[PDB]
Design a protein around this ligand. Sequence first.
Ligand SMILES: Nc1ncnc2c1ncn2[C@@H]1O[C@H](COP(=O)(O)O)[C@@H](O)[C@H]1O
Ligand SMILES: Nc1ncnc2c1ncn2[C@@H]1O[C@H](COP(=O)(O)O)[C@@H](O)[C@H]1O
Lengths: 191, 191, 190
Amino acid sequence: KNKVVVVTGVPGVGSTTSSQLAMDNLRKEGVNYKMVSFGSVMFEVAKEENLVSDRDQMRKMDPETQKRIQKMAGRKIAEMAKESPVAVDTHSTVSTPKGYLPGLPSWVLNELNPDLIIVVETTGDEILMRRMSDETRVRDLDTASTIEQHQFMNRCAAMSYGVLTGATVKIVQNRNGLLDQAVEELTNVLR
Amino acid sequence: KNKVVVVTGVPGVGSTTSSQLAMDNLRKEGVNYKMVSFGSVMFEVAKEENLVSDRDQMRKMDPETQKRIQKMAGRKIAEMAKESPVAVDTHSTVSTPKGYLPGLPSWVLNELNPDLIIVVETTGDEILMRRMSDETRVRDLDTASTIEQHQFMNRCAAMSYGVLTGATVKIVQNRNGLLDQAVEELTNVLR
Amino acid sequence: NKVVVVTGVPGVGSTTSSQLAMDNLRKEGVNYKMVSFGSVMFEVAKEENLVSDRDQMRKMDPETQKRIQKMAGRKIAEMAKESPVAVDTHSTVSTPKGYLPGLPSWVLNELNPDLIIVVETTGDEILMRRMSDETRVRDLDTASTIEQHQFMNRCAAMSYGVLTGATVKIVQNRNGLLDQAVEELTNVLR
Ligand SMILES: Nc1ncnc2c1ncn2[C@@H]1O[C@H](COP(=O)(O)O)[C@@H](O)[C@H]1O
Ligand SMILES: Nc1ncnc2c1ncn2[C@@H]1O[C@H](COP(=O)(O)O)[C@@H](O)[C@H]1O
């Protein structure tokens, strides 16, 4: 079976860019990853259905709809994993008006059957401040505490995925002024 | 077909009080939840078999007895899950002398198959303080920290239930002097 | 017969604390067969000629390790028929690739545990204990990383109970307070 890696982090923690940088590094040494964005895969389906204009509105849809578009996005990537080792960029849980939506519910977890789950964190202070200057996307500008709460539930969910699939769960800190350290750590676990 | 909701909280956090007020609010606008107490559907049995006379000692009768009066208790509520909007007042985990007992183990969970799991919290100081002025119930011997620990594990359990069922997990603070704030939030998520 | 999982990070003394407690129960009529899950894995893997030395236990590929885990679980479930069993193991093992579940769902289904015990203490005391130990003086862990491991161990433990219905008991085993931990363990295992 092809390696399936799940990378997660709350919006603004920089899990996407730091993992991308790590995978650019591993490319230069023979390691290849099919970087997939779970969010983009379901965004294309949600936009195609005229439900959303931008990716940041999907978590505002009612759970029933989010889970349906989630189920679909799952099959897409599961089929995508059949050709090469996949690095799925996504979320341990999504913060919706109805609460934390598990990003990899029972059935999706089984489709993807990941070997590794990476959780990229940092402090809520840094995450708020980063979201504060980011004009590229629509963030929820919560409090450092709310962001910590989200990271708390992400750990819980991530560890559940690990217990169900046997996947290992890696927690990596991506702190301000320390991206290099984060990239090195991510590169080693993904190698 | 009917929206099933699980409302949880440690004793004294007032999860029942607050969510009920929210459901009263939603009645005046159409939404009419049927408030059912798992703690009642699961008490009619213990009181019958003379296992438990007082509701506040079911979590101590026997780990191999309360887990048995739980399974059937859920099978009965699994029925109303085929009626109309149902709100199940129960516990994420019950603090028994043998440890934290999951309130929605795999079996019971599949019956209810909830859409939303609500976790009502507040600081250990406030919960401990509320308990100390309550006599119609007895469960005081804990500390602000043991209460936090229980809430810690309740978050974990709740999220695992979410992962297994696809349900969203909503955490609501019900802080002293701010019941109106909690009620507003509960009203919005329950809609 | 009760199947019990005893966990704790290295250095917390979960194994020794549990043993003292099980001895105390022995002198009371309750007899627990204490086994290490890792040892059981090696035994069954050696019995079916998958391995010869415990050194090769690391070289096992994902498929064979899963098989060995099921075999260990089936074996322990076999022991359960004869007496209460205490499986000494790790909720998660802190590896370079992250936290590895000690008891994946496929093992949980075989074990059907009734109680998961989680023994803890502060990161400071755990690091202190490890430093005054001849073997571990070059692991680079801090009180914080140990707290993080204990955090993930709690989530894994709670997930174990959610999937099996077992109760999860957290027990503090603090410096100078061993007797108290032993009494608690003695009471939860009784
Ligand atoms: N596993 C998932 N389950 C449900 N929704 C997801 C999942 N992964 C990503 N998303 C959604 O995609 C949106 C944008 O993705 P992202 O660019 O990674 O923030 C998120 O806000 C979520 O609504
Ligand atoms: N889902 C559940 N699983 C096991 N016990 C429960 C559950 N829900 C309620 N109870 C029991 O009912 C007792 C009283 O219910 P409550 O009035 O809601 O605090 C608790 O102490 C528990 O023993």
